[PDB]
Design a binder for this molecule. Sequence first.
Ligand SMILES: Nc1ncnc2c1ncn2[C@@H]1O[C@H](CSCC[C@H](N)C(=O)O)[C@@H](O)[C@H]1O
Ligand code: SF4
Ligand SMILES: [Cl-]
Ligand SMILES: [Cl-]
Ligand SMILES: [Cl-]
Ligand SMILES: [Cl-]
Length: 356
Amino acid sequence: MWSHPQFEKASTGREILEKLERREFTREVLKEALSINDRGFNEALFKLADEIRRKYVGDEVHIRAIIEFSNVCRKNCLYCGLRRDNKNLKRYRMTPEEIVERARLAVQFGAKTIVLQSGEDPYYMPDVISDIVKEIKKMGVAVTLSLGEWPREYYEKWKEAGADRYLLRHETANPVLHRKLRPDTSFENRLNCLLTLKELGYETGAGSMVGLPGQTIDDLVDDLLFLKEHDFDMVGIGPFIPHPDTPLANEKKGDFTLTLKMVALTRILLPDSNIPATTAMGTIVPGGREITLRCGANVIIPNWTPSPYRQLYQLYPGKISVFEKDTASIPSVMKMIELLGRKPGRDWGGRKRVFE
Ligand SMILES: Nc1ncnc2c1ncn2[C@@H]1O[C@H](CSCC[C@H](N)C(=O)O)[C@@H](O)[C@H]1O
Ligand code: SF4
Ligand SMILES: [Cl-]
Ligand SMILES: [Cl-]
Ligand SMILES: [Cl-]
Ligand SMILES: [Cl-]
């Protein structure tokens, strides 16, 4: 019959940016934004996200000092170096005293939030965690937990102990892919944990990997819409990095640009959310965290795990620099912040509601 030509790419690209600026976040708009492979479009997207960042979360880059206190995990996620079937990794557990005193040292170096992260290690759950949380809360700082999926009763105990925030990335909002990559659990379980945490009054963090095997652009759009639906306080996003001692060893690595676009779109969708420049972004590209901080991120998470454990928390290859002294990360990120013309957080850096 009659013809159906495409609009010119330049004019399409400009209309998408205009729709984002007017906050018309249709599925087709988000899909096209993630599908365009044009450096000028991408740069404009990043500039929009940076503008939104400046307006609604300002110039503070919040520093969260993480202690990865055990690499023992009862789960078997296909992507993760810590999966239980990986026997080519030395496992470790830190004592409560080691954890508490290491947190105290971060606080003295100026960290206003301590993040405690581990594999799903039953040793500590729930009472050892509670005791550690109570001790760190006496230091005058925020406490964030990232311990995986546990019963409501454990989450309730940890909140009573004084925990402020919980990070539980949704990983992938595609339920079919979620079950294939995380064969012990389900997207439904993961979402129920996130809903429970919010109900209990935690500030909650979700987020996802970009470039997982079997994940499409339509799946990434579903990730963005899920994030928007829940108005998450925090969103952690990074590229999938294949680990050699996992079933996903020979799969494609996630793409840096596409991941940066996911960060920028997250900022645009959730203007006053706390969004880190993740270590995975710094792993895949030299200076990756600094780039991400100019594309909508406003949080950085220096690695505060001590030797000799630090080098064993091998979620993905390249994660830990072996040349670094284990107290170098906090000063390092402070210098990075200074060089970007930003400033460290003044207070605990809790999510505020200033948009709308
Ligand atoms: N191969 C890989 N590439 C990139 N990020 C990875 C990865 N393996 C794991 N991660 C990320 O590292 C995060 C921490 S795992 C530790 C916390 C807890 N076990 C949990 O699963 O929530 C995960 O949420 C995941 O998104
Ligand atoms: S992602 Fe978290 S739950 Fe899954 S294997 Fe790794 S440490 Fe365990
Ligand atoms: Cl945090
Ligand atoms: Cl994160
Ligand atoms: Cl990361
Ligand atoms: Cl670091």
